[model samples]
Target: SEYQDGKEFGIGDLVWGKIKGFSWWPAMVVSWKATSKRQAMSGMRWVQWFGDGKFSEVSADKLVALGLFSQHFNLATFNKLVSYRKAMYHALEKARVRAGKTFPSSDSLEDQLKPMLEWAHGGFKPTGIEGLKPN
Candidate 1:
C-alpha cells in the first residue's frame, strides 16, 4: 500500500496473510517479488499458508510482517479482483464526497454493480455490466 513496489517480501520470507473465508494465518512468501504491473495487479506475493498447506497469490496491502502479527490478527477469485479494497473505498469516497451520492442497499448502483465492481476495484478497466452502464 505505502510502497508502490514490493521491496519487503522475498522468497522464503515468513509473513502473515489471510485467505477468503478464513482468518489471519501464518504464511511464507515463496516466490520472487512480482515485478510486472500485471502481476502486481493480482498480488505482490505468492504465499504458502502453514496449516492450509496451499499456495495462493496475495497483495502486499493484505499482508503484514510477523513482527506486526498482532495487528494483522485483527483481519476471492471470480472476475479477477485487483486492489480490491482500495478500489472499493476509492470509488466509495469519490461518490460520497465528489459526486454526493449515497450508496443505499436499494440503490441499483450498488446492488447491480457490487459483484462486478469487486473485480475492478484495482482500476482493472472493468468491462461494462449487462444493465448498469457507467455514465
Candidate 2:
C-alpha cells in the first residue's frame, strides 16, 4: 500500500531535524519540486524551520516525529510554540556558558524570555475560546 522509498511525514507535519552544527531543532515538513523525488535524494526532504523560519534540505534518516497532536493543533500555533521553545533553550545556553566565570543576570534571562512570556500571557493568541479556556 506504500512505496518503499516514500516518506513517512508530509507538509505541515511537525518533526525534529538534525541541523548542521546543531543536534536537532523543531521543523515542519514542506515541499519542493524535483526530478524524481522531493529532495536532492530519495533519502532527503525539504523542511521549513520553525525557530529560524528557514528552508533546509535534510536527510530523511535524520528526521523524526513524536506522532503527538490534537484537533486544535495547527501550523501557525505550532510554529510559535517551537520558536519560543528554541528561544528558551538559547536563554539557558547563554546562562550556562557564563555560569563558570560569572552567573548570568536574572534580568538578562528575563529579557531573553520576555517576549515569550508576553505571548504566553496572552494565551498564545488563541483562535478559539473553548480551546484556550478549557472547561
Candidate 3:
C-alpha cells in the first residue's frame, strides 16, 4: 500500500522550479534518466530553460506544478503580491495575538487568517482577481 515519487515526470514534461526559493519559474525537460527507484529520490532531468540557462541534473522534487507561477509572475505584480502576503501574514498574526478579541476563526492560523486574506490592504494595488473581469 505504498507508492513512489518521480513517476509523474517524464521526458519533455514542463515543470516549474527555482534554483533558489519558493519563487519558482518554468523549466522544460529535454530528457531524463531512469532512476535507481522508479519513484524515489535523486532522479535527474536534463532541462532547457528559457534564457541563458541550462541544467542536466535537476532532482525529482525540484519540479513544480504549472500555474503556480503563471499568474503571480509579472515582476511588479509579483513584488506586490509578495508584500501583500507578508503583510496579511503579519495582520493575521496580530489578530491572533490581540487581547480579548474573538475573531471569526479561532481554530488555527489558517482558519484565523483566510478571511483576512481576500483583500490587499490599503496602499497595495491588489493583484487579486478583480482585475480579470469585464469592465
Candidate 4:
C-alpha cells in the first residue's frame, strides 16, 4: 500500500502507536488479510495495547515497524496480479456494453468468482452461496 518507512507487521510483533491523541502505546502486531479479496469489508488488523485495556481495528498506515525489520509486503507481485484481474474486468465490461443485458448463474460462478471478481446486475442476487459477499 501507500508506504512509509520500516517493515510491515504480521500477526505477532511489538510496535508503538498513538492513543488518546495516541500516547505511543506499545501494541502487539495483530492479524490482517491480504488475500481475502474484496470480501474483507473489515478493517486491516485488530490491535490490543499493552499500555491500556483497549483494542480496535487499525489500518496498515497507522502502525510502526519498530525493529531491525525488512519490508514485509511484495508490491511487485500485487502489481502483476492487478493486470490479470483488470483484463478480466475490462473484458466483462466490454461484454456488458455490447449485450446491454445478462443472465444469472451461481453454484459454479459464485465460488469461481468469490476469490476473483463477482460483478452482477444491480437488481439480481446470488441465491445459494453462503458467506459469499454480495457484488
Candidate ranking under TM-score, highest first, comes to: 2, 1, 3, 4
Q: What is the overall TM-score of model 1 with all chains considered together?
A: 0.40
Candidate 1: segments with Cα more than 4 A from true spot: 1-4, 32-43, 74-135
- Once fitted onto the true fold, the runs of candidate 3 whose alpha carbons sit more than 4 angstroms away are 1-6, 21-23, 32-42, 70-135
lDDT of 4 by residue, 10-129 (tens): 555454444444233345554434323222123345555542435655665666642211232223432455443333333333333333434454554324433233332221123211
Q: CA shift at 97, candidate 1, in angstroms?
A: 50
Clashing pairs in 1: none
Q: Rank the candidates by lDDT, best first.
A: 2, 1, 3, 4
Q: TM per model?
A: 0.40, 0.43, 0.37, 0.33
Residues 1-135, candidate 2, lDDT per residue (tens digit)?
211367665654556677666545656666665223444456577776655767788877788752222222244533556554664434323322322212233454446555533433343333322232212
lDDT at 78, model 1 = 20
Global fold similarity of model 4 (TM-score): 0.33
Candidate 1's displacement at residue 67, Å, is 1.8
**What do the candidate models score in CA lDDT, each in turn?**
0.47, 0.49, 0.42, 0.39
Q: Candidate 2, which segments miss by more than 4 Å at Cα?
A: 1-4, 33-40, 66-135
Q: Residue-wise lDDT of candidate 3 within 44-118, one digit each (tens)?
A: 555545333445456656765332433433345335554434433453343223212233653654454455443
Q: Give the Å shift of residue 96 in candidate 3.
A: 44
lDDT head-to-head 1 vs 2, winner: 2
Error of 3 at 75 (Å): 3.8
* Candidate 2 Cα lDDT to native: 0.49
Number of the predicted model whose TM-score against the real structure is largest: 2
| Model 1 Cα lDDT, one tens digit per residue, 95-115 | 233223343454433354464
